[PDB]
Design a protein around this ligand. Sequence first.
Ligand SMILES: O=S(=O)(O)c1cccc2cccc(Nc3ccccc3)c12
Length: 120
Amino acid sequence: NSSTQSYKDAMGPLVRECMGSVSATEDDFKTVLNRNPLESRTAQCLLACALDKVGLISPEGAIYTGDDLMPVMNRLYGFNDFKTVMKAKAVNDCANQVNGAYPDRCDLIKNFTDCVRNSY
Ligand SMILES: O=S(=O)(O)c1cccc2cccc(Nc3ccccc3)c12
């Protein structure tokens, strides 16, 4: 497990809906809910679908940055935890780092999530 209950509360319903449009396993559901490394391509695609639903992805398939991140951070985590809120900097930087670089949508999300995980 690598996620808070807040993350699961926000993402769970979306990931569930995504199971209907992505050919992912029940283990993949757990991987994604737990914010674990997305080893399987199915898990990468499952999160990609849910992050689109949560408002993190632009119409053009880019990960949002700056102000456009804030509604997502609020939905996932609220604003009461200093460490989590400050992590928005790493999320913004990682989004800038990966955007444009991965034509495959699931690859974009694998690399995004890895970058965020590697960030202190
Ligand atoms: O979760 S954190 O890295 O704490 C995070 C912290 C603060 C704001 C965030 C905004 C969007 C996505 C995140 N993360 C995320 C990470 C992996 C998969 C899906 C979303 C944000």
